[PDB]
């Protein structure tokens, strides 16, 4: 699963050999214990990351130019009625996602419209999609943070960064109303690789696979 | 109320003297008909780590620096008995000194 791991000293899962890119050994639940399932989940991760990148850059631009808050932007008035806006959005997506699904069925790439792959100028190379996957995952983490700072802080990303720069000792996640829960979660996440290490050390062989409802790895147990 | 150090020391010295000079010849005879050669003896054999824990310790069968068989374990046990008896006597003296009479009248 690549020489670089999700924590130092991790062992790759048996299904997660590292043939496909972006692999770091991070599979505790092992949703993708099937090649078709794994490639579908890679496609879904790429799409959620791409939409996350688009949303994050849109929020950054709108907060830089002074447009108002995005979670309150749905209550703002706009030209064209909202019902017919949803209607035309559904109508155009019933063609766009259809072409995407057919192209993924015949090719597997994440193309657009009638061009599969939609690469007109042509810099397709494995490091490019590696960088895209990394930036995409960082973008969904950023969008989750944006939603969190819209919920509890009630301010935009730029205002949250300004408050972090003004007083980083007391303006953070851990001094907020979600502070002690975040401390507990990060404590659990710090302990978590070490319990896995103890399971690997004491369970020297056998399988010790995580048997869960979402995967059929319990059949071999 | 009886002073604690003199009572505790006297009780534990009496119990240690009873254990060494009196109760020791009766000791190592009840155990000889308990863990002797032809009878029970060792409950385990010794192959694994969880099975060697029931084996006897290393410091309880070495030899007898005392002229009798009074070892460190016997010293600790009879000293515990002496501390128990001294604390019992001190507790009875304390209950008497509080004006409360435990005995039937």
């Amino acid at each position: 699963a690549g020489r670089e791991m999700w924590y130092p000293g991790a062992t790759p899962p048996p299904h997660l050999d590292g043939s496909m890119l972006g692999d770091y050994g991070f599979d505790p639940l092992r949703l993708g214990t099937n090649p078709d399932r794994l490639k579908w989940f890679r496609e879904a991760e790429l799409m959620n990351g791409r939409w996350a990148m688009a949303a994050v850059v849109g929020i950054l631009f709108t907060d830089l130019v002074g447009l108002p808050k995005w979670w309150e932007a749905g209550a703002q008035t706009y030209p064209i009625d909202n019902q017919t806006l949803l209607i035309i959005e559904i109508a155009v997506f019933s063609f766009l996602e259809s072409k995407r699904y057919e192209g993924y069925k015949k090719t597997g790439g994440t193309g657009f419209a009638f061009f599969f792959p939609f690469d007109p100028m042509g810099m397709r190379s494995q490091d490019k999609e590696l960088k895209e996957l990394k930036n995409g995952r960082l973008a969904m983490l950023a969008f989750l943070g944006f939603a969190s700072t819209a919920a509890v802080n009630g301010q935009g990303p730029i205002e949250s960064l300004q408050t972090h720069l003004a007083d980083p000792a007391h303006n953070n996640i851990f001094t907020s109303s979600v502070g002690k829960e975040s401390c507990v979660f990060v404590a659990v996440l710090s302990i978590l690789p070490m319990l896995i290490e103890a399971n690997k050390a004491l369970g020297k062989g056998q399988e010790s696979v995580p048997l869960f409802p979402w995967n059929e790895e319990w059949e071999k147990v | 109320l009886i002073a604690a150090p003199v009572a505790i020391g006297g009780s534990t010295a009496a119990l240690l003297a009873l254990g060494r000079f009196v109760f020791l010849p009766y000791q190592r005879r009840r155990t000889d008909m308990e863990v002797g050669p032809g009878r029970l003896g060792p409950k385990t054999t010794g192959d694994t780590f969880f099975d060697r824990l029931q084996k006897p310790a290393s410091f309880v069968e070495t030899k007898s620096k005392d002229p009798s068989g009074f070892g460190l374990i016997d010293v600790l046990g009879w000293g515990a008995l002496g501390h128990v008896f001294g604390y019992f006597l001190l507790a009875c003296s304390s209950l008497q000194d509080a004006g409360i009479e435990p005995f039937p009248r």
Partner: protein, 41 residues
């Protein structure tokens, strides 16, 4: 929350938690058990 910081309960905690553990949890249990008992070999 104040004086309730371990396992903070929201006000919508029963109205959300009861239908997963009466609806979704028995369904996952039923499906997992049915795939278990019917597994061949």
């Amino acid at each position: 929350a104040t004086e309730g910081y371990p396992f903070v309960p929201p006000d919508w905690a029963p109205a959300l938690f009861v239908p997963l553990t009466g609806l979704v949890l028995p369904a996952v249990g039923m499906a997992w058990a049915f795939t278990y008992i019917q597994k061949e070999r």
